[PDB]
Amino acid sequence: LPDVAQRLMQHLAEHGIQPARNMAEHIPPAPNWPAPTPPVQNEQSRP
Amino acid sequence: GSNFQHIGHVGWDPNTGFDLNNLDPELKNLFDMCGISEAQLKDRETSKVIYDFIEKTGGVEAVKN
Amino acid sequence: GSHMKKQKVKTIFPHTAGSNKTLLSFAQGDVITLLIPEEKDGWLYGEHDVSKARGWFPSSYTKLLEE
């Protein structure tokens, strides 16, 4: 048992396998336009 | 008819994966130790690699001595 | 292994993806968990606390849940 794990990790690294304790998602690129903004603005004033 | 020598104890297949229902007293016990899950054992692309290790570096007689 | 990130925001306004497959849509008063270390072009990326939907969302339609 305990010695078999110390040699397993060396095998899995050769194929890029990892144990299920060590997996997560990734992040996408982004859209083709900038992020929108809330209803906050100035108010028109005379010269 | 005939069977393996250095292996044969392990129940794994390239279509379905390791046989959890009948797994060896060492097999599942390592999988729970290094951190592997039953999903990877049923993965024809991950379980294959995990099995190829036992076929060369595990072995029920090889781990005994 | 790993789980839900500490940093979150409350959306204060709605947003709409359309045909992009990489955007996150919601209403006002909803909650999103950040999955990335910093913003990009005003876009932030996260996972919704009610539906587990993920995508880029506008930071400006949201505020932090610190203090």
Side-chain angles (χ1 to χ4, degrees), chain A residues 38 40, chain C residues 7-13 26-34 44 57-67:
Chain A
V40 181
Chain C
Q7 198 177 100
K8 306 197 189 74
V9 291
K10 173 162 281 173
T11 77
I12 74 229
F13 284 118
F26 46 62
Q28 173 274 325
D30 280 319
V31 175
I32 321 293
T33 305
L34 283 302
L44 281 288
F57 72 91
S59 144
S60 215
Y61 290 164
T62 76
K63 298 183 68 66
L64 279 87
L65 286 175
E66 69 179 296
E67 301 298 289

Side-chain angles (χ1 to χ4, degrees), chain B residues 3-55:
Chain B
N3 288 291
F4 267 104
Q5 33 172 277
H6 58 177
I7 70 191
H9 71 124
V10 180
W12 169 91
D13 282 285
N15 282 291
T16 61
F18 286 96
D19 285 312
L20 300 324
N21 297 303
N22 293 291
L23 261 189
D24 245 49
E26 188 219 300
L27 261 278
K28 84 290 161 69
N29 233 352
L30 172 74
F31 300 150
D32 187 67
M33 165 139 58
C34 195
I36 300 120
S37 184
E38 291 74 24
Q40 310 196 286
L41 272 40
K42 295 287 300 205
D43 202 308
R44 309 101 73 81
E45 319 193 281
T46 310
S47 71
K48 175 67 201 188
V49 180
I50 304 161
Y51 173 60
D52 194 74
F53 162 78
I54 295 141
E55 201 227 272

Side-chain angles (χ1 to χ4, degrees), chain A residues 14-30:
Chain A
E14 306 253 78
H15 301 283
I17 307 309
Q18 308 184 87
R21 77 178 274 102
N22 221 316
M23 46 162 62
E25 63 244 80
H26 42 244
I27 315 295

Side-chain angles (χ1 to χ4, degrees), chain C residues 28-65:
Chain C
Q28 173 274 325
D30 280 319
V31 175
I32 321 293
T33 305
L34 283 302
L35 290 173
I36 61 171
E38 69 195 275
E39 67 305 319
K40 80 93 79 199
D41 203 35
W43 294 97
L44 281 288
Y45 186 82
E47 184 172 71
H48 208 313
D49 197 53
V50 314
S51 185
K52 310 306 298 293
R54 315 179 190 146
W56 294 98
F57 72 91
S59 144
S60 215
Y61 290 164
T62 76
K63 298 183 68 66
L64 279 87
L65 286 175

